[PDB]
Design an enzyme around this catalytic site. Structure first.
Site, PDB file in Angstrom:
ATOM      1  N   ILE A 194      41.187  38.202  50.504  1.00 22.00           N
ATOM      2  CA  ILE A 194      41.886  37.954  49.248  1.00 22.00           C
ATOM      3  C   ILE A 194      40.990  38.065  48.026  1.00 22.00           C
ATOM      4  O   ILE A 194      41.498  38.001  46.903  1.00 22.00           O
ATOM      5  CB  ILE A 194      42.610  36.591  49.246  1.00 22.00           C
ATOM      6  CG1 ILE A 194      41.614  35.437  49.259  1.00 22.00           C
ATOM      7  CG2 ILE A 194      43.574  36.485  50.417  1.00 22.00           C
ATOM      8  CD1 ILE A 194      42.278  34.085  49.429  1.00 22.00           C
ATOM      9  N   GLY A 195      39.685  38.227  48.190  1.00 21.15           N
ATOM     10  CA  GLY A 195      38.890  38.384  46.982  1.00 21.15           C
ATOM     11  C   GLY A 195      37.409  38.165  47.249  1.00 21.15           C
ATOM     12  O   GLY A 195      36.938  38.318  48.376  1.00 21.15           O
TER      13      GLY A 195
ATOM     14  N   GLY B 128      33.763  35.825  46.062  1.00 20.06           N
ATOM     15  CA  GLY B 128      32.958  34.848  45.363  1.00 20.06           C
ATOM     16  C   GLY B 128      31.644  35.459  44.912  1.00 20.06           C
ATOM     17  O   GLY B 128      31.458  36.676  44.903  1.00 20.06           O
TER      18      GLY B 128
ATOM     19  N   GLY C  86      29.618  35.980  48.599  1.00 19.15           N
ATOM     20  CA  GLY C  86      30.400  36.295  49.775  1.00 19.15           C
ATOM     21  C   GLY C  86      31.863  36.448  49.428  1.00 19.15           C
ATOM     22  O   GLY C  86      32.290  36.215  48.296  1.00 19.15           O
ATOM     23  N   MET C  87      32.627  36.842  50.442  1.00 20.81           N
ATOM     24  CA  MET C  87      34.041  37.135  50.272  1.00 20.81           C
ATOM     25  C   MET C  87      34.884  35.871  50.407  1.00 20.81           C
ATOM     26  O   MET C  87      34.452  34.852  50.953  1.00 20.81           O
ATOM     27  CB  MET C  87      34.513  38.184  51.288  1.00 20.81           C
ATOM     28  CG  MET C  87      34.459  37.726  52.739  1.00 20.81           C
ATOM     29  SD  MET C  87      35.174  38.910  53.908  1.00 20.81           S
ATOM     30  CE  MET C  87      34.740  40.481  53.162  1.00 20.81           C
TER      31      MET C  87
ATOM     32  N   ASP D  37      31.422  28.659  32.379  1.00 20.88           N
ATOM     33  CA  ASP D  37      31.849  30.011  32.741  1.00 20.88           C
ATOM     34  C   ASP D  37      33.370  30.062  32.864  1.00 20.88           C
ATOM     35  O   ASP D  37      33.927  30.675  33.777  1.00 20.88           O
ATOM     36  CB  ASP D  37      31.172  30.498  34.024  1.00 20.88           C
ATOM     37  CG  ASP D  37      31.244  32.010  34.177  1.00 20.88           C
ATOM     38  OD1 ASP D  37      31.471  32.689  33.149  1.00 20.88           O
ATOM     39  OD2 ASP D  37      31.077  32.520  35.305  1.00 20.88           O
TER      40      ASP D  37
HETATM   41  C1  LIG Z   1      37.941  30.061  47.191  1.00 25.07           C
HETATM   42  C2  LIG Z   1      38.267  29.976  45.716  1.00 25.07           C
HETATM   43  C3  LIG Z   1      37.148  30.505  44.839  1.00 25.07           C
HETATM   44  C4  LIG Z   1      37.378  30.248  43.354  1.00 25.07           C
HETATM   45  C5  LIG Z   1      36.921  31.286  42.338  1.00 25.07           C
HETATM   46  F1  LIG Z   1      36.352  30.628  41.232  1.00 25.07           F
HETATM   47  C6  LIG Z   1      36.103  32.513  42.668  1.00 25.07           C
HETATM   48  O1  LIG Z   1      35.286  32.523  43.533  1.00 25.07           O
HETATM   49  C7  LIG Z   1      36.352  33.738  41.797  1.00 25.07           C
HETATM   50  O2  LIG Z   1      35.608  34.859  42.219  1.00 25.07           O
HETATM   51  C8  LIG Z   1      37.857  34.006  41.897  1.00 25.07           C
HETATM   52  O3  LIG Z   1      38.243  34.982  40.918  1.00 25.07           O
HETATM   53  C9  LIG Z   1      38.207  34.509  43.290  1.00 25.07           C
HETATM   54  C10 LIG Z   1      39.633  34.240  43.657  1.00 25.07           C
HETATM   55  C11 LIG Z   1      39.996  33.358  44.574  1.00 25.07           C
HETATM   56  C12 LIG Z   1      41.349  32.905  44.985  1.00 25.07           C
HETATM   57  C13 LIG Z   1      42.406  33.790  44.781  1.00 25.07           C
HETATM   58  C14 LIG Z   1      43.705  33.443  45.129  1.00 25.07           C
HETATM   59  O4  LIG Z   1      44.720  34.338  44.935  1.00 25.07           O
HETATM   60  C15 LIG Z   1      43.990  32.204  45.663  1.00 25.07           C
HETATM   61  C16 LIG Z   1      42.966  31.296  45.861  1.00 25.07           C
HETATM   62  O5  LIG Z   1      43.290  30.092  46.390  1.00 25.07           O
HETATM   63  C17 LIG Z   1      41.621  31.611  45.531  1.00 25.07           C
HETATM   64  C18 LIG Z   1      40.616  30.549  45.806  1.00 25.07           C
HETATM   65  O6  LIG Z   1      40.887  29.507  46.345  1.00 25.07           O
HETATM   66  O7  LIG Z   1      39.386  30.865  45.407  1.00 25.07           O
END
Ligand SMILES: C[C@H]1CC[C@@H](F)C(=O)[C@@H](O)[C@@H](O)C/C=C/c2cc(O)cc(O)c2C(=O)O1
Length: 348
Positions: free
Chosen positions: A21-22, A24, A27-28, A139
């Protein structure tokens, strides 16, 4: 271990059925099914142990989030790592699964004024708690704001946070990098280390402007370009505001510029609620000492439908000093991360 896109993502057997889903910082991020609580969750993989700075950012966030408890801050539900320091290569942080982030949402969705108002209220409500703990997020940006299916908002990523230190905030011209560029307050480029709470209020003002139009208000193309964009809209700073900048390199840079007029907010945002633009103006104030504070912003008429100080809680145990981390080698930091995550081990 289960694998995701040719990478170990070793979270089982409690957490299964993984989806990318994205990303950090180290890491992913994946979604997964929590076989104990019978709900899907989000899991962030972290691999910091080869670099001192990465261990610092990791330890800082873990310490902050294990003490914080607030509805508009996404917490830590679980932490997964190996049972010994020798075997610990990665750390996984388990958190509530949200629907989207505000960066993605703004790419394709126009927000109603009611959504803008509700989103801004929740950002400031969480920020009130953060600042009441003597902590700066440092940030804030759309990609760090998560939303669920009913538009509840939670603040994410405390890896760049610091304990506020207003008495040691002064520095020189063009030396500081704090925050992501588009959300960086003008004083960062002029004379500030980003150790005061007004740094976060500027970022929230940038987010508000971006919610009004779905485009960043100050889209600098590179570090040096950022102040061009801020001054192009705010106009030339007043004499009073220049006199607050004692540093000669910063002040003489501003004095060397031709006069720039202020661009009226209602010409930039002709559809916007006039109360929203009044609050926007107060958040995007050039002089950080004149800039609105978080509890003033919550009490602004734009937010009157939501404002309730008794339902806007503050922290029980503020942080008194920054965690003394610098010069600490990565080996001691790994040991500290191990100890800080011990409460989640099966056992204890
Ligand atoms: C595990 C946490 C991390 C929180 C965040 F600050 C990051 O690490 C950034 O890179 C975000 O842009 C990444 C997006 C995450 C994210 C996306 C969703 O569609 C639903 C979610 O629950 C999450 C989530 O929990 O992210």
């Amino acid at each position: 271990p289960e694998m995701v896109r040719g990478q170990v993502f070793d979270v089982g057997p409690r957490y299964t059925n993984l989806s990318y889903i994205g990303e950090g910082a180290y890491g992913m991020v994946c979604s997964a099914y929590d076989n104990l609580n019978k709900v899907r969750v989000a899991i962030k993989k972290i691999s910091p142990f080869e670099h001192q700075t990465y261990c610092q950012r990791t330890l800082r966030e873990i310490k902050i989030l294990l003490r914080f408890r607030h509805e508009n801050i996404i917490g830590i539900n679980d932490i997964i790592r190996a049972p010994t320091i020798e075997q610990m290569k990665d750390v996984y942080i388990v958190q509530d699964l949200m629907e989207t982030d505000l960066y993605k949402l703004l790419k394709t969705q126009h927000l109603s004024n009611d959504h803008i108002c509700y989103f801004l209220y929740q950002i400031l409500r969480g920020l009130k708690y953060i600042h009441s703990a003597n902590v700066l997020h440092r940030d804030l940006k759309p990609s760090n704001l998560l939303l669920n299916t009913t538009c509840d908002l939670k603040i994410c990523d405390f890896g760049l946070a610091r304990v506020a230190d207003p008495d040691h905030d002064h520095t020189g011209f063009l030396t500081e990098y704090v925050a992501t560029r588009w959300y960086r307050a003008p004083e960062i480029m002029l004379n500030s280390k980003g150790y005061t709470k007004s740094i976060d209020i500027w970022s929230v003002g940038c987010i508000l402007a971006e919610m009004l139009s779905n485009r960043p208000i100050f889209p600098g193309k590179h570090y040096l370009d950022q102040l061009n964009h801020i001054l192009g809209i705010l106009g030339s700073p007043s004499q009073e505001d220049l006199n607050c900048i004692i540093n000669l390199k910063a002040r003489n840079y501003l004095l060397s510029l031709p006069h720039k007029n202020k661009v009226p907010w209602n010409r930039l945002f002709p559809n916007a609620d006039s109360k929203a633009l009044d609050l926007l103006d107060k958040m995007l104030t050039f002089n950080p000492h004149k800039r609105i504070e978080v509890e003033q912003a919550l009490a602004h008429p734009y937010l009157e439908q939501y404002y309730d100080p008794s339902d806007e809680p503050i922290a029980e145990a503020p942080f008194k000093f920054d965690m003394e981390l610098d010069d600490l080698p990565k080996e001691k930091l790994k040991e500290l991360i191990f100890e800080e995550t011990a409460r989640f081990q099966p056992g204890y």
